[PDB]
Amino acid sequence: RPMWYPGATAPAHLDGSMLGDYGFDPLRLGVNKDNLKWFREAELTNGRWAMAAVVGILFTDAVGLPKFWTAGAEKYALDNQTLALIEVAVFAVLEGKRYEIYKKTGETGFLSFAPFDPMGMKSEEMKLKELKNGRLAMLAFLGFCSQAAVYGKGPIETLQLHLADPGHNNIYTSSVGPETAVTVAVLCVLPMIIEATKTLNPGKESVPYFPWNEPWN
Amino acid sequence: KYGENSRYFDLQDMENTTGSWDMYGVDEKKRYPDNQAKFFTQATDIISRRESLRALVALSGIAAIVTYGLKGAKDADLPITKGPQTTGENGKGGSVRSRL
Amino acid sequence: KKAQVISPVNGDPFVGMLETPVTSAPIVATYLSNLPAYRTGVAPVLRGVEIGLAHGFLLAGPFIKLGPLRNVPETAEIAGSLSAAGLVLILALCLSIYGSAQFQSTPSIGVKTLSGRSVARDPLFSADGWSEFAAGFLVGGEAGVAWAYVCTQILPYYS
Amino acid sequence: EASNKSFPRDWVKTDPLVPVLGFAGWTIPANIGVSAFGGQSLFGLFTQSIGENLAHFPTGPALDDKFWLYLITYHLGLFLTITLGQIGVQGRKQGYW
Amino acid sequence: AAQGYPFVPPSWAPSVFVPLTGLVLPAIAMATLFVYIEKEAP
Amino acid sequence: KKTIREKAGWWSNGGNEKLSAFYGPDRGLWLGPLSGTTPAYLTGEFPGDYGWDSAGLSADPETFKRYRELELIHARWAMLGALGCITPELLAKNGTPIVEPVWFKAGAQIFAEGGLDYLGNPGLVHAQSILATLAVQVILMGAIEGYRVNGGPAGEGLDKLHPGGQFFDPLGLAEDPDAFAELKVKEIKNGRLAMFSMFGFFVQAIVTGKGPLANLDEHLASPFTSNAFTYAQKFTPQ
Ligand code: CHL
Ligand code: CLA
Ligand SMILES: CCCCCCCCCCCCCCCCCC(=O)OC[C@H](CO[C@@H]1O[C@H](CO)[C@H](O)[C@H](O)[C@H]1O)OC(=O)CCCCCCCCCCCCCCCCC
Ligand SMILES: CC1=C[C@H](O)CC(C)(C)[C@H]1/C=C/C(C)=C/C=C/C(C)=C/C=C/C=C(C)/C=C/C=C(C)/C=C/C1=C(C)C[C@H](O)CC1(C)C
């Protein structure tokens, strides 16, 4: 199976049993298996919400609407506090039933539809596509907020800015330029350090001395 | 046996011999209201494990202390956040040589 | 010259506790037995909630009346309640790591109750039991600190 | 101690006559007028101090109140009388003489 | 990052890292090294 | 015999006499102890049996189950009404600008200039025509109320009054048998209360012509002068 960098050897806990397993856990947060199940459900939930959020920010910035980091300060039909109140009140039951569905099944569900599948298109292929698009959408939303924090523009005005001058309107010519440049450089040279770790200790997995890892075993 | 004739050592009763006693512990199950017990058993379900409670502690404490540094020490109006509000002890480097 | 009060513990003069009125007076033993620490049949999570409510309500007072912001009128209670919340969180972490450290051996010796009937071991003194005890302690402590703030806000004669 | 194998529950041998007789033996003599008090008594001045301090009910007594003197002397003698009464009752009942 | 030499820390960096290094990292470290030292060899 | 914490009902595990007061022959009745002869067909196996068939309309069991159906449907509709009658008035006294928050004049809001602002906001519903509103209402309600009697997309072979599948019990409160049987009589008692209160809303709108929360405030201000008797002289025949 493909990996997060070419020729990567996966950790002993990321043995490809789950989907999206590109062997990515350099911090070994998924050494515990129940933690890994909870983290998979959390990955897919963060990703579902970021999918909806990315498409929503896109639909909002596509038309003449307030910017997504200023849309909360607009005036609405309800007061702020009652909005938050009803939100908490309904999400109480919603997330309670979702947590119950996780405890029962191990996957998500709406309220009682353990598998929210009106149109029965559930598959492992569709699961992998949901996971992949959800990771992509988490990255996309992070980028929305980040290049709306450097600039005062949302997704597509910044995209048009990059398309206007690709060499001069990019992340390395903005205020966060240098740190992203050095970060990208380190991330490019990192896998060879990791591959040295794998090479000079052939077959021997190493423990990185982390608190969540229980490295004394 | 144990409790009579000053026979303070019995192999069949090693708890009374060694002193493994519950001086005050009672084993009664009828303490709390079952609605309240259900509430407070359900309210602790997500943290009833060691690693999960340590995760909540880490999250909440990192967040509390980070937002303390960002807004809370200012909301508390700590002097380190307000600054000196004066010239300070700049020009008085010493009693002899008043350095900056 | 009769009627000696001080007795050895459970009649055993070699264990070394010397049952004494402060130890084993009827009212004192009644009070200590009724405390949620010594209710070895109830779930440890609920006893932890009760203990934590008490301790989180009491330890807000010092931070409120003696903290660094004790003299600013309205910021005092907020500051002290946040401080008590932090201390309760620290104590909950302490309890969790204590449950990690202590409960690994499962000692096989039984427990009696000063009257002969071999009671069971308290589920509190088990890893899962102490995990849920610390969970209950966190929940109850934060709730008790919050209610201490509430009582500063709503009580009539709160000076 | 070959005996005392259970820590008896009646460790204090309660005779309800003891507190009554101690309160009576201290307080009734505590209501005898002496000219050092100006013709008044220790317990009478004590009840008067409590009356004046009950007027301003929330705030507590002062330091120069002279209420504390009456309280402390009355309770010294009272606790001594009750203590020696219990001792004497359970010394006459038991042996000890 | 900042104008001039980049990688100048923010103004709020002390206010964050001094509490971290002093309240958080010592908590993590002492907890980890407590669970390590009370751990029993199987 | 029984200790103090059991009399308060601390322990919800050993409660088996909870349905004894609402089902079975030893239950509460309509006139209490002043109702001896319970009707012999109202045996108490259904929720809301207080032994009240004084007009005798439900002696036959088929008529009785049709009347039970009508009672529960009217109960749920009046519950939704009595929640949906006061809450525009509650949100107008909150400060949300609903322009005609009384329920008996809310239908005329669609004949205004700006149509029917939902929460007083043009960003909301903003429905202008009463005709398309009633058309989509009769289409949607025909589909739903026709799905109700013989099943449909949200359950087919379920009970005609209590389906409770994945759509009508999504929170799952009625999984337990005793909890479902207790919340049945809770439902029908809240529904009879709301049916009585909706009849009160109808009569209060007819003879006073003001808001029900306005009626509540005019009774809270003056209870003895502003009762139902100060409007008793409003239908005198001249
Ligand atoms: C022992 C005393 C006792 C009495 C007197 C009543 C009385 C009543 N209960 Mg009952 N209950 C009693 C015990 C208990 N009830 C209940 C639980 C219930 C429930 C759940 C219900 C009742 C209902 C009723 C009513 C049934 C008959 C009716 O509809 O009258 C109708 C006739 C009148 C009330 C008299 C008319 C009113 C007025 C005095 C005369 C008209 C005045 C106007 C000025 C006239 C002008 C109008 C003109 C324009 C035409 C009746 C008022 C039912 C109800 O509420 O119906 C309304 C009902 O649903 N009871 C419990 C719990 C187990 C009891 C325990 O002891
Ligand atoms: C969904 C992924 C995604 C995509 C398609 C883009 C695309 C773009 N970004 Mg955004 N960005 C992202 C994620 C993404 N970014 C994230 C996660 C961050 C947080 C670090 C940012 C932060 C950011 C800033 C601060 C700036 C941009 C800018 C830009 C533009 C120029 C590229 C550049 O200099 O940034 C390079 C981006 C990174 C180094 C971030 C990591 C990107 C990852 C590796 C994904 C790369 C794309 C992926 C392989 C395939 C995309 C899927 C599909 C659309 C084809 C371009 C429109 C610049 C711009 O428009 O200025 C005019 C700019 O100033 N981005
Ligand atoms: C498994 C699937 C689960 C799906 C659950 C249902 C999700 C429903 C999301 C909300 C959809 C409502 C849209 C109705 C049509 C509006 C068309 C329109 O013109 O919009 C127009 C509106 C804007 O219009 C504005 O309305 C405001 C309302 O006060 C103001 O009045 C403004 O003046 C007006 O301009 O656009 C939107 O509001 C779109 C927002 C949609 C997302 C809202 C946040 C929800 C995010 C969490 C979702 C939680 C899901 C669980 C809770 C529900 C459980 C049943
Ligand atoms: C039991 C018995 C017994 C004996 O024997 C005999 C007899 C007497 C006969 C019987 C009795 C009966 C009765 C009482 C009946 C009654 C009923 C009712 C009242 C109902 C209501 C009923 C009521 C109802 C439905 C109601 C409903 C409601 C609804 C829909 C809604 C509404 C609304 C709203 C939201 C508001 C807006 O703005 C509009 C509207 C639209 C307006």
Automatic annotation (TrEMBL), chain A:
Annotated organism of origin: Chlamydomonas reinhardtii (Chlamydomonas smithii)
PANTHER family: CHLOROPHYLL A/B BINDING PROTEIN
Annotated positions binding chlorophyll a 20: 129, 133
Stored InterPro entries: Chloro_AB-bd_pln, Chloroa_b-bind
Chain positions recorded as chlorophyll a 25 binding sites: 151, 171
Residues annotated as binding chlorophyll b 2: 129
Residues the entry annotates as binding chlorophyll a 8: 43
Residue positions binding chlorophyll a 11: 46, 95, 98
Binding, chlorophyll a 3: 4, 188
The name this protein goes by in its record: Chlorophyll a-b binding protein, chloroplastic
GO MF entry, a single one: chlorophyll binding
UniProtKB/TrEMBL annotation, chain C:
UniProt entry tagged with the keyword DNA-binding: no
Residues involved in chlorophyll a 2 binding: 31, 55
Domain Photosystem I PsaL reaction centre subunit XI, first and last residues per copy: 6-155
Residues that coordinate or bind chlorophyll a 1: 31, 37, 55
Primary localisation category: membrane
Protein family: Belongs to the PsaL family.
Name this protein carries in UniProt: Photosystem I reaction center subunit XI, chloroplastic
Organism: Chlamydomonas reinhardtii
From TrEMBL, chain E:
Gene Ontology BP terms: photosynthesis
Role this protein plays: May help in the organization of the PsaL subunit.
GO cellular component, as recorded: chloroplast thylakoid membrane; photosystem I
Localization: Plastid, Chloroplast thylakoid membrane
Organism: Chlamydomonas reinhardtii
Name of protein: Photosystem I reaction center subunit VIII
Main localization, broad class: plastid
Key words of the record: Membrane, Photosynthesis, Photosystem I, Thylakoid, Transmembrane, Transmembrane helix
UniProtKB/TrEMBL annotation, chain F:
Sequence positions that bind chlorophyll b 4: 125
Amino-acid positions noted as binding chlorophyll b 1 in the UniProt annotation, renumbered to this chain: 30, 76, 125, 129, 137, 145
Amino-acid positions noted as binding chlorophyll a 1 in the UniProt annotation, renumbered to this chain: 50-52, 58, 71, 74, 109, 119, 192
Residues annotated to bind chlorophyll a 6: 208, 219, 228
Residues that hold chlorophyll a 2 according to the record: 74
Compartment(s) of residence: Plastid, Chloroplast thylakoid membrane
Residues that bind chlorophyll a 3: 76, 162, 164, 187
Positions of chlorophyll b 5 binding: 125, 129, 235
Binding site for chlorophyll b 3: 76, 154
Keywords: Chlorophyll, Chloroplast, Chromophore, Magnesium, Membrane, Metal-binding, Photosynthesis, Photosystem I, Photosystem II, Plastid, Thylakoid, Transmembrane, Transmembrane helix
Biological process, per Gene Ontology: photosynthesis, light harvesting in photosystem I; response to light stimulus
Molecular function GO labels: chlorophyll binding; metal ion binding
Recorded GO CC terms: chloroplast thylakoid membrane; photosystem I; photosystem II
Membrane topology: Multi-pass membrane protein
Alphabetical list of InterPro entries matching this protein: Chloro_AB-bd_pln, Chloroa_b-bind
Recorded superkingdom: Eukaryota
Protein name, entry field: Chlorophyll a-b binding protein, chloroplastic
Source lineage: Eukaryota, Viridiplantae, Chlorophyta, core chlorophytes, Chlorophyceae
The gene coding this protein: Lhcb3
